[PDB]
Amino acid sequence: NTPKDQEIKKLVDQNFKPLLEKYDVPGMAVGVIQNNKKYEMYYGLQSVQDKKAVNSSTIFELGSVSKLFTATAGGYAKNKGKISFDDTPGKYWKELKNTPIDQVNLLQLATYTSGNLALQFPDEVKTDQQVLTFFKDWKPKNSIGEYRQYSNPSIGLFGKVVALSMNKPFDQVLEKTIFPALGLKHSYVNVPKTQMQNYAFGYNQENQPIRVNPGPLGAPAYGVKSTLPDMLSFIHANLNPQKYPADIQRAINETHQGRYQVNTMYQALGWEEFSYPATLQTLLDSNSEQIVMKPNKVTAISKEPSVKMYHKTGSTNRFGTYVVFIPKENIGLVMLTNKRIPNEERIKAAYAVLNAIKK
């Protein structure tokens, strides 16, 4: 193989492969894209019980990386004029008109600043009807727009509004509009029967196979499944949006604009944004308990960093998804697994690889 193939294989073997034994992870896919060249490394098993090895067709759960597709869908709708980020949700979900949540705008929902939405819905909110009742009954707490609290309900409501503005269900927004515009072939909200043999099982801490059961309004927060080649195409689109037709190009660019700052992290749509180079500590700090689990006051931005990079983790207690890209270096990395790996390990391994790859 090419010298670049061998160099990148060695770096991934050195930095990602040891995580498999350390965390007893059945399967992993790691990809690098550099200058429109893709490098794919597959390890282990998609299904332990079937002894099916991970391969280029293996579909993994993206978990919280799904929010990047919700963000792209929102950027797409905004740039088609179907929504404005200054709108409020009751303009689209009419049952929310004349309720307190209709005082929060769509950008605030997308970027977690409503001031009273936690990581998850309350346990008793289990059905679509109950989600609507929850939002009708909601009242504000913190000054709207001033505090970031990472929140699945918040971006879930944003995704629902995006779908309503496009006159189709959220799963169809992604599967019929967004995924095709990004050139993705095996990315799904609902995996079809003809692809179930490619759909990796997840594994809990007892190494038992588990298959996600959907939660209400879950798809925009954590409901996307994809392959390594598709995720490398997605990173390519984020690195080279100018090469794509206007509607999706504008959508991608919309997700790259920082909207406010918390310490050294800038919150874009879905993506977290940093000045490049970001120190390893800066990247780790973005994943701290303080940032992920607690409210943090935001600061308006005067201007975005001059040179930028972006990342997004899955949940640290779910599996092992992580994506990162650096526009100036025309490079990005994707990691997918079917077993929990701490987010700090994902960030550290990707940092080592991207810092070592030759130009």
Numbering used by the authors: 3 to 361
Kindly provide excerpts from the paper associated with this entry.
ADC-68 is a representative of a group of intrinsic chromosomally encoded class C Acinetobacter-derived cephalosporinases (ADCs), with more than 350 variants currently reported. These enzymes can produce resistance to penicillins, narrow- and expanded-spectrum cephalosporins, and monobactams. ADC-68 differs from ADC-1, which is not a carbapenemase, by seven amino acid substitutions and is still the only class C enzyme reported to confer resistance to carbapenems by itself. In this study, we selected a triple mutant of the intrinsic class C Acinetobacter-derived cephalosporinase ADC-1 (ADC-1TM) that confers high-level resistance to the carbapenems meropenem, ertapenem, and doripenem.
The Ω-loop in monomer A of both enzymes adopts a β-hairpin-like conformation; however, the B8–B9 loop shows a large variation in conformation. In ADC-1, this loop bends outward from the active site, whereas in ADC-1TM, it folds markedly more inward. In monomer B of both structures, the B8–B9 loops adopt a similar conformation (different from that in monomer A) but are ~1.4 Å apart. This difference in location is a result of the Phe322Ser substitution in ADC-1TM, where the smaller serine side chain leads to rearrangement of the main chain of Arg321, whose side chain now projects in the opposite direction and forms hydrogen bonds with Asn204 and Gln207 of the Ω-loop. The proximity of the B8–B9 loop and the Ω-loop to the catalytic serine (Ser64) and the active site suggests that any conformational variations of these loops may affect substrate binding and/or catalysis.
